[PDB]
């Protein structure tokens, strides 16, 4: 049985998808959260110098979504058919591409607010509208059961709602989908028990 | 029977090229549909997420270049050998795609675009090259013991970067050897010869 150690900041951020997957599959792991001060010494040891990382039986994996896909392989979270797995991958990359546009590391707090604002004002509504149309009246984003794409939607939309509360005022179906993710017992339990962080 | 494949993108290597190498390598027939920057605005409003490339499979539309590449390579010799090696393949690909994605391809302000391209290539790119160099070490391929689509993606992304920064790999002969090996694979070599010659 694999020993798992997840390393990231004390933050939902890019690690959260992995956290939801372990919760859902009832897989025990070490949720190793590092204070900023412990980062330079860890970073120096990593091939690509980024987190999150996941150690599996003492072997290091990197890239949040690569890890997420590895953990869901051969499970019901992956997608039920090969083409469905493709749609799961595609939705995840669409969300990630958008989340990746935000200047998270930008030090000038004034340059940062100008950019976050432009993305949320002009770009975000187009995405939400595309996601809404894409979902239509279906139960989940892909197929007839929950996938890690639904989890990723709930996670990304939570972050976006921190900056733009009215993001989904015109998309009750997308709100419902968040609530469906949030009501899954293993996910709800995680949401109840996790550390409260802005991001 | 055999699925009908139609790829849509600009007349450009860009984000479609990984798909093109994969079809070439797997010897799969497809319609390589290339659109003009003038016909773009129209087609855009018809795509579920308004981005290219898209791949139509028997009339069903797929999107996201790397989602498509993973779909085409699943259960093939281009996927990683083990489930764990498949993770390494995906992680290298995302590392490369993350960096290429930092470039402001769509920036409407030329001066801003130029400034960020220069900064990415002067500061960020050399660090990524050293990381990749150390990662590859003296191994033949990036992951496992045979070529994967990660090696393909390296060659494609580095091709792009070399357009803007010709000296990028002067200090990395092992990364050059890998590109040369990808470029020498007969099906890839054949594609590189016959593809439309574009800047990017
Ligand atoms: C340390 C920088 C920081 O404050 N954050 C890191 C990035 C991030 C945060 C929240 N979501 N998120 C994220 C999730 C997925 C994809 C992505 F690009 C970004 C908060
Ligand atoms: C229309 C914008 C443009 O000039 N290009 C599109 C983006 C691009 C080009 C070349 N490589 N590339 C690319 C490849 C992979 C990942 C990625 F983010 C970007 C050229
Ligand atoms: N696409 C990657 C991005 C990883 C990334 O950029 N992570 C940040 C933390 S959110 C990091 O480690 N940055 C470098 C640093 O802070 O030293 C992933 O999803 O894992
Ligand atoms: N990560 C996506 C990016 C897709 C993307 O942004 N493609 C560009 C062209 S290279 C596009 O469609 N631009 C949107 C537009 O110009 O309207 C992928 O790899 O497919
Ligand atoms: Mg990506």
Curated annotation (Swiss-Prot), chain B:
Organ and tissue specificity: Expressed in a number of megakaryocytic cell lines but not in platelets. Highly expressed in adipose tissue, macrophages and placenta. Also expressed at lower levels in lung, heart, lymph nodes, appendix, bone marrow and fetal liver.
Residue span(s) of domain GST N-terminal: 3-80
Regulation of this protein's activity per its record: Prostaglandin PGD2 synthesis is stimulated by calcium and magnesium ions. One calcium or magnesium ion is bound between the subunits of the homodimer. The interactions with the protein are for the most part mediated via water molecules. Magnesium increases the affinity for glutathione, while calcium has no effect on the affinity for glutathione.
Quaternary data: Homodimer.
Database matches in SUPFAM superfamilies: GST C-terminal domain-like, Thioredoxin-like
The protein's name in its UniProt record: Hematopoietic prostaglandin D synthase
Gene: HPGDS
Induction: By 12-O-tetradecanoylphorbol-13-acetate (TPA).
Keywords: Calcium, Cytoplasm, Fatty acid biosynthesis, Fatty acid metabolism, Isomerase, Lipid biosynthesis, Lipid metabolism, Magnesium, Metal-binding, Prostaglandin biosynthesis, Prostaglandin metabolism, Transferase
Family label: Belongs to the GST superfamily. Sigma family.
Main location: cytoplasm
InterPro entries, A to Z: Glutathione-S-Trfase_C-like, Glutathione-S-Trfase_C_sf, Glutathione_S-Trfase_N, GST_C, GST_superfamily, Thioredoxin-like_sf
GO molecular function terms listed in the Swiss-Prot or TrEMBL record: calcium ion binding; glutathione transferase activity; magnesium ion binding; prostaglandin-D synthase activity; protein homodimerization activity
Cofactor(s) listed in the protein's UniProt record: glutathione
Effect in UniProt of substituting residue 98 to N: Reduces PGD2 synthesis by 99%. Loss of activation by calcium or magnesium ions
